[PDB]
Design a binder for this molecule. Structure first.
Ligand SMILES: *[C@H](O)[C@H](C[C@@H]1CCNC1=O)NC(=O)[C@@H]1C[C@H](C)CN1C(=O)[C@@H](NC(=O)OC(C)(C)C)C(C)C
Ligand SMILES: *[C@H](O)[C@H](C[C@@H]1CCNC1=O)NC(=O)[C@@H]1C[C@H](C)CN1C(=O)[C@@H](NC(=O)OC(C)(C)C)C(C)C
Ligand SMILES: [Cl-]
Ligand SMILES: [Cl-]
Ligand code: NA
Ligand code: NA
Ligand code: NA
Lengths: 301, 306
């Protein structure tokens, strides 16, 4: 028993992290087979980060303008190409620690582990969620770009996030490993702001089921609700709508605990109305929304 | 910016995890050089656990009674010995992935990362604190015993915890890697309970500094207090005493933010006496105590491991 914000073991990703320098900018790269992936903004200079023309800037680069270091070893760059907002540096050596991997683009509400790195070296690992407004609430300092987010269900690493920038509210934006930003953001210094965020309702429900599995009952009640009445209430608290997909995915947890999904929704309605009255749920005095249904089943079962 | 509950990168430890089977019990072992470490209760039947006589049960065992597997490679056990509550299985092969490491015993209030494993396979990593009552608030299922806790300094892994048991309130107990339990617990099937716990005051202060660094300042006030006066308040709220050494350890964060420790203590006093008034600090509505001062400095300055 117990329930913790649990990340995937990071070793398979640690063996892929390298340092990339272009000009005066250093950040991290992801070295898989004979390709190093990194944010293309490594090639911007201080005289034009507002409207960089990345195609024009990259054609002017020689392979030797990129300094790639794997621990104590310089890797020789032999070609370069750009895919959306990611730079792909072909190097003369395949990474012998390349794991089984795939690239996956995730949806809002999905969670993943982040291996925060500086100068090609890992600093720490933590869990994140893709927020409804397509930001993540990370912990990232200068030099962290190119750090990645990933899952490792079974034995294959699914890379889903590469870090690029920090927005004015202190939250973070980045791309999938095909270089497409999550959300409307762009790798330019033009004014940009995250939309108003909302709470990931399906995940809150998953976490309430985790609390029941771990022995909590105090927030249960004798009421149920229709799906549409639930959404009408939940949206008044800036919660995301709960879809029939979400109801369906919570089925297994509802079967395991004997609490129907719409019965648990009535519990959530009451918690939003009343608060916790000095109590806690799984060690939190707030409703937690960065555990998915899949996360709850993985950690509890 | 940002501030997360952050674990150490687990790669150096993942390469040490193996599966150990004795009889019908399977759990995890820690393979370092040519020794595998695991909980000694692996040798017990449900019978023996009632009142185990560990040294008598162990002499009865032979090397072949222990099946050790690194991935799908069997490691031959060539000797065995007990050290306190940990079993040491000598194997015929040194682990080629052995990192630089040492065994350390931590103090209550100190944090560490847990690599939760099942069947010798790493499954997840999370950050814990050794509670003042010598339990940890872990997340552990059947088969998790032998999972370890650790810290990293530069390139050296310091192993500090091996998991043995779950107590009735759902918290967890285990040993250091020399087999000494943390807390007044025994690896015997007898009634045992976590004692009343307390809050790790120096860690709450460190997390308030982390909040200030990250722009969260509503709880700051013009007042200061004395160590004496604040500790009378701490006692009242089941907070651990704040010592002068704690104050000194927080000095760097005081210099960085302009908030002296006793100035921050006056903030904490008001939070304890008045609550949060509906507000939050670093995304929490409770006062968080599982970040040490060193954790805050490391995370906020980007320290890495080699
Ligand atoms: C890459 O290592 C770096 C990571 C940042 C630094 C601080 N925390 C992080 O997560 N990313 C950047 O420096 C990118 C490059 C881009 C040209 C600017 N940038 C930013 O993160 C900056 N944000 C920014 O300009 O935001 C808008 C004005 C576009 C909203 C910040 C350094 C301010
Ligand atoms: C080892 O994998 C296992 C880990 C446990 C299982 C459930 N969660 C965990 O953290 N450890 C045990 O099963 C040990 C072995 C011992 C013979 C019993 N035991 C327990 O953890 C049990 N606790 C227990 O008996 O507590 C007292 C009554 C002794 C206080 C629990 C399985 C109940
Ligand atoms: Cl005063
Ligand atoms: Cl909280
Ligand atoms: Na894609
Ligand atoms: Na109900
Ligand atoms: Na003050």
């Amino acid at each position: 028993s117990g329930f913790r914000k649990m990340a995937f073991p990071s070793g398979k990703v640690e063996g892929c992290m390298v340092q990339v320098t272009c000009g005066t900018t250093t950040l991290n790269g992801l070295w898989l087979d004979d390709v190093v992936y990194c944010p293309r903004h490594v090639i911007c200079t201080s005289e034009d980060m507002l409207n960089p023309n990345y195609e024009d800037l990259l054609i002017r680069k020689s392979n030797h303008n990129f300094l790639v270091q794997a621990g104590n070893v310089q890797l020789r760059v032999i070609g370069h190409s750009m895919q959306n907002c990611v730079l792909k540096l072909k190097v003369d050596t395949a990474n012998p620690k390349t794991p089984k991997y795939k690239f996956v683009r995730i949806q809002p509400g999905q969670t993943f582990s982040v291996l925060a790195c500086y100068n090609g070296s890992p600093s720490g690992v933590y869990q994140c969620a893709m927020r409804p407004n397509f930001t993540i609430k990370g912990s990232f300092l200068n030099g962290s770009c190119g750090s990645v987010g990933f899952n490792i269900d079974y034995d294959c690493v699914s890379f889903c996030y590469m870090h690029h920038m920090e927005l004015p509210t202190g939250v973070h934006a980045g791309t999938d490993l095909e270089g497409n930003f999550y959300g409307p953001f762009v790798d330019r210094q033009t004014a940009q702001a995250a939309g108003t965020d909302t709470t990931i309702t399906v995940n809150v429900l998953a976490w309430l089921y985790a609390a029941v599995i771990n022995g909590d009952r105090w927030f249960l009640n004798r009421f149920t609700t229709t799906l549409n009445d639930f959404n009408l209430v939940a949206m008044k608290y800036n919660y995301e709508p709960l879809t029939q997909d979400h109801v369906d995915i919570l089925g297994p947890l509802s079967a395991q605990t004997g609490i129907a999904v719409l019965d648990m929704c009535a519990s959530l309605k009451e918690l939003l109305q009343n608060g916790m009255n000095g109590r806690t749920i799984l060690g939190s005095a707030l409703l937690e929304d960065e555990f998915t249904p899949f996360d709850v089943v993985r950690q509890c079962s």
